[PDB]
C-alpha cells in the first residue's frame, strides 16, 4: 500500500483547491487519515484529520475554510481548501495511521510524496 | 503455573489491603472456576470502585496465580479502553479487530484470560460485540468460550460504594462489617437498576452475563501506610515511619471526617522522592 | 580507538539531566516570588524522570494560578516544559484549551490525541497543555491514554498542564494540599453537573476520579511576576 497525492498547484488569494489521495490498498483499517503541510524552513504541521467513522478535526488556522472527507470504498481521502491566502503555501502530505488494539502503543504511519500548493497574494 | 486455593489465599491476604469483600469474592470465584474441568459459562467478573484501590493490582494477583508471567503470560490479554479504544467513532474498526483477536486466542488456548480495563469508558457497542463470548452457549461460531475468563475493571459505582463505607464509619461500625448486600442496596438505583440488568442479561437463559460484581472500597490513612511500607522495601530503602506518616498525609474527604484519600494509593509514591535520594 | 577527557572536565554521565538542572536553576531568577516548594518539588520530580533508564510512566505536572497570575502561568509552564529538553533545540508540543469549552468534544479529543502522538513520535519529549479547565469535559478522557501509571502511550516524556483558577488572587503562603484542593474542586465543578453517572463518552464524578488520580502528582501554585503580567513572556 502506497499513498499518492494529486491536485496541487498555484491559486490566487481567495481561491480554492481540492487535494486527493489515492491509496493502492484498502484504507478501512486506518484509524486516522489526514493532511499535513510543510512550508519553507518550518516543521511539518497537522492540517486536518478524520477517523474511519468520519469524525473530523482541524488545525485552528484552517477552521471553517478546509474540509476533509474519506471514502473507505474508493480508498481515497480529500481536502477541500477554500479562501486560500499565501500563509497556506506549503507542500501538503497525506498521512495514514494504523494502531494496535492490544499490547504496547505504536503507530504504523504511511505518507504520500507530497504535493506543492502555492498561493499568490 | 498450578493454581492452588492456599497460594491464592496467601497472596491476597499478604498483599491486598483494605478490601475484605473483594478478597473473599475473588478467592472463591477464581478457585471454583479454574478447578472445574467442565464449566458451563466463562467466568465473568466485574471489579468496580474507587480509583487507586486495587483493581489492576488484584487482576495481576489473579493472572500470576494462574499463569507464569502474570499479565506477561502469552495467555493473558489486557485491553485498556482509554488507550486501545479511545475514539468513539472508530467502534467498527475496534470491533472487527477485537472479535478476531478473542476468537483466535481462545481457538489456540481454551483457558485464555481477557481483562478489559476502564470499561466505563468503553463504547456500549463494543461491549455488545463481546456479549456472545460471555454467555451460556456451548459454541460460538464453533468455538467454546466456557473455559475462558473475562475480567472487567471500572470506576462505576465508586461514589455510592463510598457512601456505604462513610455510613458505617460514622455509625461506629467496623469496615469489615460491610456486607455485599449493603453495597447492592446502595447501587440498586444505578449499577444494579433494571436498564443495566437489561443490558447485561443473557440472550439464552434468565441470568446475568456478569457472574460476580466485586466492589472496591475507598482507602483510609492506615491503608496508605501499609502500601508505602511495601513500596519502600521494594526500592531497597530503610523504612522510616516518620516518612511513612508524612507521605500518607494526602488529601482526604469529606471535609468534616477526612477519612478517605481522594486518589486511593495513587500519586502517593511520587512523594517518596521528596524524602529519599 | 577511544578518546577520554581528563576526569577534571567532569563530562556529564547524563547530558539531558545536567542541562535540565542548570536551566531549571536559571528559571528561578526569571520567576521571582514563587513558593520554595515549587522549585524544590519540581526539580526532584523531573530529575527522577530524566535519570530513569527505563521510566515506567511519564512526568505530569500541574501549575495553577489565580487570574492575577495568568501571564506568569503561561510563561512558567512553557519554560518548564522547554527545560525538560535543555540539552536540545527540541521544543515543547503546545496545546491550549482556552476558548474550547463549547467545541465538539470528540473533535477536540481527536485534535489533542494527534498533536501529542505525532509530536512524541517525532522526537519531542514534552508537551505544555494550557488551560486544562477549559477543554470540553469528555475530551479530557484522552489524558488517561497519556498519563496512566502503567500503560501510558509514551513513558519517557513530560506533560505540563495548567489550570487557571476563577478567583482573582492566590495567597502567597498557600501550601501544597490546599493548592491541590483548589484545582480538584474547580475541575469537579467544571467537568460535572451532579454525582450521577453518565454514558461512556461523557465525564461523570466516578470517571473524573480516575483522570484526577493520573494527572495530579504535583500541583504547584504560581504567583504573578509583575514584569511578565505587564510586558508578556519576552524570553
Ligand atoms: N488495596 C490495595 N492493596 C495494596 N496495594 C494497593 C491497593 N490499592 C492500590 N495499591 C497500590 O496502588 C497501585 C495502584 O492501584 P491499581 O492500579 O490497582 O488502581 P485501580 O484501582 O486500578 O485504579 P483506577 O480505577 O484509577 O485504574 C497498586 O499497583 C499498588 O501499588
Ligand atoms: Cl483510534
Ligand atoms: Mg486501574
Author numbering:
A (entry chain C): 3 to 123
B (entry chain A): 54 to 330
C (entry chain B): 236 to 470
Please quote the authors directly.
TorsinA is an unusual AAA+ ATPase, because, unlike any other family member, it is localized to the endoplasmic reticulum (ER) and the contiguous perinuclear space (PNS), and because it is not self-activated, but instead needs the AAA+-like proteins Lamina-associated protein 1 (LAP1) or Luminal domain like LAP1 (LULL1) to catalyze ATP hydrolysis. The structurally similar luminal domains of LAP1/LULL1 interact with TorsinA, and they provide an arginine finger to the TorsinA active site to facilitate torsin’s ATP hydrolysis. Primary dystonia is a devastating neuromuscular disease that is predominantly caused by the deletion of glutamate 302 or 303 (ΔE) in TorsinA. We obtained high-resolution crystal structures of TorsinA as well as TorsinAΔE, each in complex with LULL1, using a nanobody as crystallization chaperone.
To investigate the atomic details of the weakened binding of TorsinAΔE to LAP1/LULL1, and thus the molecular basis of primary dystonia, we made use of the observation that VHH-BS2 also stabilizes the TorsinAEQΔE(ATP)-LULL1 interaction. We were able to crystallize TorsinAEQΔE(ATP)-LULL1-VHH-BS2 and determine its structure at a resolution of 1.4 Å. Not surprisingly, the overall structure is almost identical to the wild-type protein (0.34 Å rmsd over 276 Cα atoms for TorsinA, 0.27 Å rmsd over 226 Cα atoms for LULL1), except for critical differences in the TorsinA-LULL1 interface. The principal difference is that helix α7 is shortened due to the missing Glu 303, with a slight--but significant--restructuring of the loop that follows to establish the connection with helix α8. For future reference, we suggest renaming the ΔE mutation ΔE303, rather than ΔE302/303, since the position of Glu 302 is effectively unchanged. In the dystonia mutant, the TorsinA Glu 303 – LULL1 Arg 276 charge interaction is lost, and the hydrogen-bonding network involving TorsinA Glu 302, Phe 306 and Arg312, as well as LULL1 Arg412 and Glu416 is disrupted. The TorsinEQΔE303 mutation abolishes binding in this assay, as expected. Since the ΔE mutation causes a local change within the small domain of TorsinA rather than protein misfolding, it may be possible to rescue binding by developing a small molecule that resurrects the weakened TorsinAΔE-LAP1/LULL1 interaction. The observation that the nanobody VHH-BS2 stabilizes the TorsinAΔE303-LULL1 suggests that it could possibly be used directly as a therapeutic.
